[PDB]
Amino acid sequence: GNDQSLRSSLLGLRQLLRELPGDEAPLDALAETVLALLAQYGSLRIAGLYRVRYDRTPEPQPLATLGEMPALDADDLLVRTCLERGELVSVRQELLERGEQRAHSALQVCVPLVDTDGRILALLAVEQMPFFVFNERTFSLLAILAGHIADLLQSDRRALQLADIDAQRFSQYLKRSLLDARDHGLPACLYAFELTDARYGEEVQRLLEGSQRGLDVQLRLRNDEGRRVLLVLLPLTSAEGSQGYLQRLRILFAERFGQARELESLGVRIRQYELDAGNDRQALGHFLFNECGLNDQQVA
C-alpha cells in the first residue's frame, strides 16, 4: 500500500542509477532526483542536499536545492548535531509555533544519508516543511528513504569487493530490511524454497530464478542435508504483498508444470519468515541455520 509507493520510487531511482554513463559520480548526477524524492515523501517546501566528506563535514555548496533555499551557515548546531550523531534531528515544535524560525535564522530538520556500513554519504537540510508534517511519522519515512537511497548510491567498491554481486546485493538488502524492521517496524519477508526431489530440482530452480522481479533478491545455496535451497528476500513488503508473491508464484508453476500439480508435488518445501520488531533477535538464526539447515558462512 504505502510499501509499494516506496518500492516503486526506489526502483525508479535504481533504474536511473543503472543507466548512468560510468564516468559520472552518482551523487552528483542524480542529486536533483534524490532531493525531489525526499521532498515528495516529507512534503518539503524549502530544502538542500549536501555532499558529506569522509570526515563527517558537509560541502557548503549544495548538490541540489528546493524552493528558496538559503546558503548554509558557519557551524549550525542542527547541521553539526546530525553529522556528529549520524541520525535525523529536529528543532522543537514550539520554535515553529512561536514563529521564531526567521529570527534565530534556524533550519527545521537535518537528515543524514547513511548506508548499511554507517558511512554518511550526504546530508538533507530542511529549511521549511508544513507544520502538519513536522511529526514522527514523517521524520521516520524520511529516515527510511534516506537509508535506502544511500545504499543504492553505494554502487561502487563492489567493483573492489570479491563476492558475487548477487550475494553482495542480498546481504546489503537483508541488513537494511533488518534496520527497517528494528528501527521503524517496516515489514519484509524471507522465503526459503528447499528442493527435495532431485528429478525436478534443476527446472524448479530455473523457474524460481526467472521469477525475480523489482527489489526481490535471491541466494542459491546447499543446506546441510544435500539439498538446493533458494532464499528469497522481499524488502519493504507487507503480509498482503508477501502472500500475493506466493500466489503469483503458484500461477507461474501451474503454467510451467501440471495445472494438476502443486509446487509441493515437485519436492518443494516452503519455509517463511516475517521480519519484525517484536521478533526474537535470535529467531532469524533458528530459521536460517537449523530450520533451513544453512550456516553463518553462507548468510551473514
- The per-residue DSSP string of the chain comes to -HHHHHHHHHHHHHHHHHTS-SSS-HHHHTHHHHHHHHHHHTT-SEEEEEEB-TTS-B-SS-SEEESSPPP--SS-HHHHHHHHHTS-EE--HHHHHHT-STGGG--SEEEEEE-TT--EEEEEEEEE--GGG-SHHHHHHHHHHHHHHHHHH--SSSSS--S-HHHHHHHHHHHHHHHHHHHH---EEEEEEEE--TTTHHHHHHHHHHT--TT-EEEEEE-TTS-EEEEEEETT--HHHHHHHHHHHHHHHHHHS-SS--GGGGTEEEEEEEE-SSS-TTHHHHIIIIIS---TTT--
Resolution number, Å? 2.0
| Contact by Cβ (8 Å): 73, 148 | no
Same domain? 1 vs 111: yes
| Contact by Cβ (8 Å): 108, 45 | no
Same domain? 174 vs 153: no
| Contact by Cβ (8 Å): 91, 108 | yes
Same domain? 16 vs 108: yes
140, 164, 188 - which closes a domain = 164
Experimental approach taken: X-ray
Same domain? 121 vs 197: no
| Contact by Cβ (8 Å): 180, 238 | no
135, 164, 193 - which closes a domain = 164
| Contact by Cβ (8 Å): 124, 111 | yes
Q: How far apart are CA 112 and CA 119, in angstroms?
A: 10
Domain that holds residue 230: 165-300
Supply 11's cell numbers.
526502483
Same domain? 121 vs 219: no
Same domain? 175 vs 200: yes
Structural domains counted in the chain = 2
110, 132, 164 - which closes a domain = 164
Provide the CATH number for the domain around residue 185.
Answer: 3.30.70.2880
Q: How far apart are CA 112 and CA 123, in angstroms?
A: 5
Provide the CATH number for the domain around residue 20.
Answer: 3.30.450.40
Same domain? 120 vs 185: no
Which of left, alpha, beta for 258 (phi over 0: left; psi -120 to 50: alpha)?
beta
Q: First vs last Cα of the chain: how many Å apart?
A: 30
Same domain? 153 vs 198: no
9 contacts: CB under 8 Å, gap ≥ 6 = 37, 40, 41, 145
Same domain? 144 vs 169: no
**Planar angle of CA 256, 261, 264, nearest 5 degrees:** 100
Same domain? 169 vs 143: no
Q: How far apart are CA 66 and CA 13, in angstroms?
A: 18
How far from the centroid of its chain's Cα atoms is residue 44's Cα? 21
Annotated binding site for 3',3'-c-di-GMP: 4, 7, 213, 216, 237, 248
Q: How far apart are CA 246 and CA 243, in angstroms?
A: 6
Annotated binding site: 4, 7, 213, 216, 237, 248
Q: How far apart are CA 154 and CA 148, in angstroms?
A: 10
Same domain? 147 vs 187: no
Residues in the chain, overall count: 300
Same domain? 183 vs 264: yes
